[PDB]
Amino acid sequence: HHWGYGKHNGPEHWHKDFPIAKGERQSPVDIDTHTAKYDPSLKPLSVSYDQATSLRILNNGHAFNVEFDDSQDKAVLKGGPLDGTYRLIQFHFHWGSLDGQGSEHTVDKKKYAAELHLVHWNTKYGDFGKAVQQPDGLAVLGIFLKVGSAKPGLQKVVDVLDSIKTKGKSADFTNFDPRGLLPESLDYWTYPGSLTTPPLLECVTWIVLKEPISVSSEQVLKFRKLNFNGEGEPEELMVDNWRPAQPLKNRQIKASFK
Ligand SMILES: C[C@@H](CNC(=O)c1ccc(S(N)(=O)=O)cc1)Cn1ccc2ccccc21
Ligand SMILES: [Hg+2]
Ligand SMILES: [Zn+2]
Numbered sequence: 001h002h003w004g005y006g007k008h009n010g011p012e013h014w015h016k017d018f019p020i021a022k023g024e025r026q027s028p029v030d031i032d033t034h035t036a037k038y039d040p041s042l043k044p045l046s047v048s049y050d051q052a053t054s055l056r057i058l059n060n061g062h063a064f065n066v067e068f069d070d071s072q073d074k075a076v077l078k079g080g081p082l083d084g085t086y087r088l089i090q091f092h093f094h095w096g097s098l099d100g101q102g103s104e105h106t107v108d109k110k111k112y113a114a115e116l117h118l119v120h121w122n123t124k125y126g127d128f129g130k131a132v133q134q135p136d137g138l139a140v141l142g143i144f145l146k147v148g149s150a151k152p153g154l155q156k157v158v159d160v161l162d163s164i165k166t167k168g169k170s171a172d173f174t175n176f177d178p179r180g181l182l183p184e185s186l187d188y189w190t191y192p193g194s195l196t197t198p199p200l201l202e203c204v205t206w207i208v209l210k211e212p213i214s215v216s217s218e219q220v221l222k223f224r225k226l227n228f229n230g231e232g233e234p235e236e237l238m239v240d241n242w243r244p245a246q247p248l249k250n251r252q253i254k255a256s257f258k
Pocket of ligand 3: 092093094117
């Protein structure tokens with residue numbers, strides 16, 4: 001009865017309504033560093049978020065999304081393994097109920113406390129709706145979060161969570177700079193995959209950053225006080241909204257560094 005991350009409608013049940021869940025290029029996957037192939041022909045990533053227009057933040061019952069104005073080429077991603085220009089449309093997180101779990105992708109079986117997804121769509125296709133119908137329609141920039149010192153750029157996001165506590169609530173969120181959530185280095189692994197939540201469409205080129213960002217115990221704690229439920233329903237904490245690693249099948253993970 002509409003997907004979730006619970007015992008009764010969680011990841012292992014998604015295949016009943018979304019048959020593609022057992023396909024050939026499903027995400028997330030485990031990054032085995034010793035089998036990733038160094039590819040010297042990969043180009044440096046090109047992140048241009050200087051004219052980024054954030055609009056609002058909302059709780060959709062699965063996670064919280066900060067949306068951006070993508071009517072024009074304001075914030076894009078170019079280079080790396082990409083072909084063409086991809087527009088930033090929204091970013092969201094996946095997190096756990098404990099510091100030792102949260103991320104969707106793992107590195108050599110190791111799980112991080114959470115994972116950030118910056119979602120972009122191929123401008124060649126006109127609009128997001130069309131992009132989700134093509135093999136190279138999306139580009140998701142994934143960043144891992146580990147518990148340590150505080151991250152300044154994340155605090156503004158943390159402060160407003162109280163106003164979007166339950167399903168369906170939103171709040172205006174203008175003038176937010178995404179550049180405050182990037183690690184120093186832009187080295188990455190890349191592979192062809194899918195969305196990690198229903199519809200689970202196989203239209204994504206995944207770009208996972210090697211270097212994770214640090215956030216405090218207090219910062220992640222705040223994420224854990226959100227609700228899956230809308231106002232007036234019984235309370236169900238929003239935690240562990242992540243999908244388990246899927247088999248790689250016949251794909252190869254390419255690294256941009258040695
Ligand atoms: C795609 C959904 C919207 N979902 C996403 O855009 C999305 C983006 C990134 C991730 S993640 N975590 O992999 O980065 C997950 C979801 C709408 N929608 C629902 C049914 C549906 C059918 C056709 C087209 C769009 C449709
Ligand atoms: Hg697709
Ligand atoms: Zn995601």
